[PDB]
Amino acid sequence: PALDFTVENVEKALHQLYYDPNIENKNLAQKWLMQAQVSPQAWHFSWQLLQPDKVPEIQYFGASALHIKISRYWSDIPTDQYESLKAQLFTQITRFASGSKIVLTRLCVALASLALSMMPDAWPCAVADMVRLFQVDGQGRCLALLELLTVLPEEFQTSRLPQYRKGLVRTSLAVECGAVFPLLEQLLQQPSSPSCVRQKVLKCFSSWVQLEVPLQDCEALIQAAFAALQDSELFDSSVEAIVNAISQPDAQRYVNTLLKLIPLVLGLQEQLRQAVQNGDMETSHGICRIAVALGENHSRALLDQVEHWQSFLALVNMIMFCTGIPGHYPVNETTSSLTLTFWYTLQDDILSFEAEKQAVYQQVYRPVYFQLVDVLLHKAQFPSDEEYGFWSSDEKEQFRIYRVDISDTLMYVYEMLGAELLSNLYDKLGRLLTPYSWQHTEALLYGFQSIAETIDVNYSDVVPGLIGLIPRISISNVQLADTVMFTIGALSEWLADHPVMINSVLPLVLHALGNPELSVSSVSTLKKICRECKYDLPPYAANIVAVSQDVLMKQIHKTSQCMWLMQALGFLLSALQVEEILKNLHSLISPYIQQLEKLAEEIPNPSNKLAIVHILGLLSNLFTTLDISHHNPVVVVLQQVFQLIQKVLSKWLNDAQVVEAVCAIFEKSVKTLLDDFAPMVPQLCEMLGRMYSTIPQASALDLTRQLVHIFAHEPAHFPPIEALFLLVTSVTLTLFQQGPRDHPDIVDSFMQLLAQALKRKPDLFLCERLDVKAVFQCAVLALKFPEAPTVKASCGFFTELLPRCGEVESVGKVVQEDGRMLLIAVLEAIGGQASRSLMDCFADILFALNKHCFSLLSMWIKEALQPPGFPSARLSPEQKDTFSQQILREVNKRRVKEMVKEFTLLCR
């Protein structure tokens, strides 16, 4: 059974793919169509699909097929058919003037692709030829022409070509731009042109300025586009054209036209003023996009040209006006957000100038920025509760993110204004605290929160008084309280240096740990406190653990929130004296162990699962941040834990999540204590070794790697870890036989382990159990993997192993015995079997081969290159020799990457 690639069959297949509900039917139809598109018969049937007899859904495939035949497979198209292929397209495009827009666009894309594929010399004047060819409808002909001319430059931005060809095309295209522009200018200038056309003109112009085109040439179309802004149907087109022509990178050099642009943008002000009043969001939004597009893209130059300081100021004001548009951003006005970027740039530019002139400009724009603070704090101010509750969830989130962006801009504003701003904020807040709406207080406090973290201690006079004000603030409303907590959390680093103030803020935060509505803030703040102010915290600690116990006893916090509290308590205990710390930790973990005992004895239940996970996680988090080493009783607790852990593991081995959670405790506890992790090593190796024999898990490999890197040098705890390593190697390699690509995580992690081991203790490779040949086989196979990070890790291992040769006889013999295959695999990878991103990770290996074993690499490369077209068929016989001669020399490491890049670029 078979279906020849004819129009009827292709059409039936299209109808099936587009309408048949069966998945496999679509998957079959689509494949048969994959064949149909590439098939030669396509050249005949495509046109027949474009006939008026068929639905647009069918016609479009006909157009797309052509587009793909030309774009993907241009090399196959014979030279004699060229003209025949061109002309045809044109004619069809003409027919689709009144036809479906989608198909017309696809055909124009196709013709553009053909043009670019024969742009350099074969089609000398494509633009002028299109113009002449188009000049039965007349208006639709112009529209089609404009669509083509619009698609032409963008299809170049995505056309994949070699550097020389790409440049050679870009030049000839730049030549054509100057022929396209007048056609656009004339069509716009003439009053006999309809809006439908003018839009296509603006879009065409905008599509052309996406390429690096001299602004001085664009000027006329800029003027016309500014004129078109008064028209309602042309606004969205003209604004995009204007912005795309102004915001372009090359426009920075042309200051002469950029100065002539300024008075035009200031002209839009009355249309902006009316739009803000009339509630026309689209218009004010567009006009603001224009204003900012000028501002942020030409600020430094506009300031440098001091002779027009008056204009720029006005511009700034306009932008300021767009910042202070009455109402809130999410709903009332879409404008304000767009403004933010500009402000930063201006600040930057003003700080970029030499100090002498910088003072001159700062004297002008400092009050502008002080006004910017008043504006931004008022807009970020929450609306009334009655109104806010009515906002769309999307709108609330929009305002949240928006508020984050403002919080970000205030951070730089502080870098500009300095302590004076802090003084103003403190004075305002004090004035407010000393009807009454929390929104204002929370606004100022939000500004203070945004700024506080970046504030230096050198000029921090406001901070003490601020901390003085914090308790005076009402905890009535939740948002204000959250802002308070976050503000404290930001003040943490300052609170560490001045522990006398801690007593005034601590109870305010500990109270918030009780309320469930503040969970995210409070805890975080507490963590941020405990992590920063640890040495001075122990006198207050008795109440902290007590309140932590009560707040945890009640189900006030979600689990993920509790975890942070466990980390916090870890940081807290890290400072306290040993005995008291052990007693307190025992007290806090005592209810947790009892619940763990209760879950283990019970048969594995779905309700019990999450309950066990919670305890395991709380333990892990408690262990992550508790470190008396300040780079241990935690080991004492770990020993007692080990039995219950073993029972729980015996009961819940099959559950992957629970197992991972159980391993996590050891992972964190090991990462925390470097040298103090030794007295638990013998017990840990037996637990992990049995766990890895049952089911392979990458986390276990990583843990073994950590144990290796930490405890290698200390021999006293080395013997048990050695057995776990060798066991792991035997289990992986045997698992790898069943499925190579089946478990990339395990492979990647294993490569990490072997690399760490090769670096830390090369002698370990001498042991007999490990199949040093099979390992090398697995790593050699790893470079072929489609998973990128696994390949990268294998490359890392390779990079580590090479200098170890000679120093270790196992590595030397292994490399001598199986060395050629590795270079074969690397050359295969460079040839085109690997992505271009990991190339630099591959090259490293090669470089190492030069640094460790020149004599072997010379012969290996020499032999590997001999067969014709080994890495790639495109490679010439002389190029193999140039790569050989280059790579041979005993050469810097960085140049090898460049050589490799050029080679792989040539191959692909």
Partner: protein, 169 residues
């Protein structure tokens, strides 16, 4: 309710793993280049009722691209995906948007940044400016840690049905 969603974006992004994560609830560690289009129906429960999104999973690699734009026809909406750890994917975004608009102009599209869960991030969160349109919104999704899993489909469902109040069951 039936709505066709075309899932596009650069190759190796992890969109197939997202779809698989939603269909089976299992994250797949291994990466296989998707050939052509992978059509899978995903159904989400809502207070209005059940909404069905027919996901056409597009090839990202150029060589496996296949029919390409031909999948886009009749799509009510789209999801563009990029890898946070790789800048090139983000650089290619306007290209995917451009091809999508040509076939379907005003359809709601969601931009998704993935592998955010990964410690090292190549793309800062500040850079994203795609959501500046009314029919566009950005999300940080993590197919592994399941962070913001339903968010794109939720936003799309709301914008399509016409009910901003619509929530997931």
């Amino acid at each position: 309710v039936q709505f066709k969603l075309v899932l596009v974006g650069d190759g190796g992004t992890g969109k197939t793993t997202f779809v698989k994560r939603h269909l089976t609830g299992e994250f797949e560690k291994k990466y296989v280049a998707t050939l052509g289009v992978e059509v899978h129906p995903l159904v989400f429960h809502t207070n209005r009722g059940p909404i069905k999104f027919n996901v056409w999973d597009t090839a990202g690699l150029e060589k496996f691209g296949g029919l390409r734009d031909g999948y886009y026809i009749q799509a009510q909406c789209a999801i563009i995906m990029f890898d946070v750890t790789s800048r090139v994917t983000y650089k290619n975004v306007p290209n995917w948007h451009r091809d999508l608009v040509r076939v379907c102009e005003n359809i709601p599209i969601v931009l998704c940044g993935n592998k955010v869960d990964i410690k090292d991030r190549k793309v800062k969160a500040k850079s994203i400016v795609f959501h500046r349109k009314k029919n566009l919104q950005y999300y940080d999704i993590s197919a592994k840690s399941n962070y913001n899993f339903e968010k794109p489909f939720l936003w799309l469902a709301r914008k399509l049905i016409g009910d901003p109040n619509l929530e997931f069951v």
